[PDB]
Design a protein around this ligand. Structure first.
Ligand SMILES: Cc1cc2nc3c(=O)[nH]c(=O)nc-3n(C[C@H](O)[C@H](O)[C@H](O)COP(=O)(O)O)c2cc1C
Ligand SMILES: Cc1cc2nc3c(=O)[nH]c(=O)nc-3n(C[C@H](O)[C@H](O)[C@H](O)COP(=O)(O)O)c2cc1C
Lengths: 401, 401
């Protein structure tokens, strides 16, 4: 069951084909995997752990290479339970001599496991570790995407074990990046980044620079989820893209998302979608009842403009638009132009409220929100056409620098 | 397709068995109906209309009694499109002499239909209209649930035609309240009230005061949706209940709703549910990923305390919790004790935020929110039981005047 990466390095763990609800916050339409890394040396070391419920597959995999009693070192790089869920089981089965974790990792281990007597040892940034013939180097990557986050570097073998970093939610027979079509791989990478790492874009960038600062140029990047990046070109692929993702530069893409009860806000949205298309923008029109918030977020990640519609419902906006907005704000998308619109019957707060949201997210609002009393008319359409042109011109402007 | 209520009065329209998404904001798990009433007089009159897509079933039903072109009068009591959507088709088929609507109704009628030459005639609160042998009386019921809302009274026949008021989403072969079990009938009435009329509880009470003030004591109540209330006892039941619904008096019921990614907030919730039971409360423990916002609302309608849990997700609360609170805040539930709890990893804003939400809704917060770093301990459990005891204590007090 274990998969050879290179001599003495195996990928063990579990393929979770069925995962759809990914850890309660986003979706993983292609399932996911839980990746752990067994390193054979004087000190036999296991890097990462899996979801509690997959302890069996992990020990089965390990056992296919070595009797679990022979592992001496446990390296825990992230204390999220999909990574650390099996730690108690592995301690029991392996009776490790030393459990290695970052300084922030040990705190989180405590608050997650409240453990009595574990041979825990905190390593520090750039610290090194002899495993025998091989030596691992530890780098801290706080807030990527948790404070405990740290990565492991094998300078000689050029193997980076990156915990969630560079992860992608892909369940498949293929475990390496080069066995998978680029378009699939990449969309999965972006989906993954946009929905969890995005609010730590800056740390993304600083983290990459100092790893580059050090001599980290992998041939292997080994994430907790998805396929292994195999090859200096692939690993370079990975790092470029992370840089591109954290940078969040605008494109000629417009994402409009809305909800509606009686379709007036839907009609406005459809007209906006058409006007933008006329200004040369690529348009995604997404209904909140048909699109998960993480799906809107994935589309928003490389969009230049985000336009939001809601009718006024009980002195506010529809629940599903509010939820999606809360989601998006949390992930802190950068460099976007905002837009807002809706239908109302009397009090009309929705566009006011929508504008507060976007503004509060640092979105640029060149055009004022179009609000319409109930069912829109040709004039109202003219107004929307106008809002669309203003936004697009500003967009067009932004993309020229 | 027409149903004889009393001599010269027929129920026409459409049974919508498949309705689940009810008009974009709530659920109609039992389907719904679109009720219009044909009254045979010298001046033959049609009250209400149906969703546009059912104009055919409506005309067929109508025609079962009389040729549609014989209808003289159209009374439009609510301009929401499930009530007024077939108005254009009916003007066409009936060529009515007069369209009767409220003053605020004629307003909404233009911003929805933008009509050019319609014989619209505004009726006033208390105005009467001779239809020939019968005479109908019009009462205004603004914000029940739109400004244009008005109801129609047949004082001699003791027939109240009430638009959405008293409506229930029930699709069935049975069209009368006495043909369905009360518990079924009642639950649907509350579900209907709780998710659309609740913010207008005061108007609810006022309007009921004035109809009774005048001599409205119906033998039949005829709403837009669901079964007809047949018999003064039934009609008294309906009005009894609306008063009860609008009064929102506490009960010993606690509704706990939460979302969670790694189940620690769930465990806290499960503990809470048990303590509250221990305090002799009835508990509804509802997961936002499994329960529609409208469902939670229905449970909350007669609960005395609302407890909300969310882990901290990106410096805030989980989207589905936010969306549900948004929904709930708009429906303005009254006389409720609030509570909050959650797990966090570092920033810990969720309970802070939940508290601001509850307090902003005017909820009483006798107990401090319980927050836990990651995975809770017995001690944390102790805190929650304590929390549950404080809130329940406060509940009990309230329940004795
Ligand atoms: C359940 C419900 C709640 C409403 N509450 C409000 C309100 O608070 N303020 C408002 O101005 N109109 C409100 N309206 C009216 C809608 O905003 C109006 O019908 C609008 O045109 C609906 O847009 P849509 O077609 O995009 O659904 C409400 C309508 C519904 C059905
Ligand atoms: C997607 C993600 C985002 C997080 N966001 C934060 C954060 O902004 N602030 C914080 O203190 N905790 C954060 N946490 C940590 C969770 O709140 C912590 O794991 C908590 O125990 C989750 O509770 P739950 O088991 O009820 O899901 C985050 C964890 C996840 C997986």
């Amino acid at each position: 069951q274990a998969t050879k990466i290179i001599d003495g390095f195996h990928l063990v763990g579990a393929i979770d084909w069925n995962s759809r609800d990914f850890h309660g916050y986003t979706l993983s339409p292609m399932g996911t995997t839980y990746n752990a890394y067994l390193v054979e040396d004087e000190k036999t070391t296991l890097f990462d752990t899996v979801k509690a419920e997959y302890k069996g597959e992990l020990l089965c995999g390990i056992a296919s290479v070595i009797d679990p009693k022979k592992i001496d070192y446990l390296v825990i790089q992230h204390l999220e339970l999909d990574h650390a869920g099996a730690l108690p089981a592995l301690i029991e089965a392996c009776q490790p001599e030393k459990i290695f974790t970052s300084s922030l990792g040990q705190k989180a281990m405590e608050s997650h496991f409240h453990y009595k007597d574990w041979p825990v040892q905190v390593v520090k940034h750039g610290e090194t570790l002899s495993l025998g013939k091989r030596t691992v180097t530890f780098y801290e990557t706080r807030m990527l995407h948790w404070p405990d986050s740290m990565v492991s570097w094998f300078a000689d073998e050029k193997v980076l074990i990156s915990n969630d970093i560079f992860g992608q939610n892909i369940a498949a027979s293929e475990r390496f990046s080069d066995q998978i079509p680029v378009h699939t791989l990449e969309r999965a990478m972006r989906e993954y980044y946009a929905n969890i790492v995005n609010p730590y874009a800056p740390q993304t960038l600083k983290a990459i620079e100092t790893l580059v600062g050090a001599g980290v140029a992998p041939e292997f990047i080994c994430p907790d989820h998805g396929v292994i990046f195999r090859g200096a070109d692939q690993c370079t692929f990975a790092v470029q893209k992370y840089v591109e993702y954290a940078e969040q530069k605008p494109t000629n893409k417009v994402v409009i998302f809305y909800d509606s009860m009686w379709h007036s806000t839907e009609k406005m949205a459809r007209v906006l979608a058409e006007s933008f298309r006329d200004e040369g923008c690529t348009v995604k029109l997404m209904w909140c009842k048909a699109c998960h918030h993480s799906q809107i977020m994935s589309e928003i990640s490389d969009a230049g403009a985000v336009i939001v519609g809601s009718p006024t419902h009980n002195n506010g906006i529809l629940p599903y638009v509010a939820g999606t907005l809360q989601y998006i704000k949390g992930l802190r998308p950068q460099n976007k132009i905002g837009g807002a619109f809706g239908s109302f019957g009397w009090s009309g707060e929705s566009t006011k409220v929508l504008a507060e949201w976007l503004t509060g997210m640092g979105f640029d609002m060149p055009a004022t929100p179009v609000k319409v009393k109930n069912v829109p008319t040709h004039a109202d359409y003219e107004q929307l056409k106008t809002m669309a042109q203003t936004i697009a011109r500003a967009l067009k402007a932004k993309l020229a620098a």
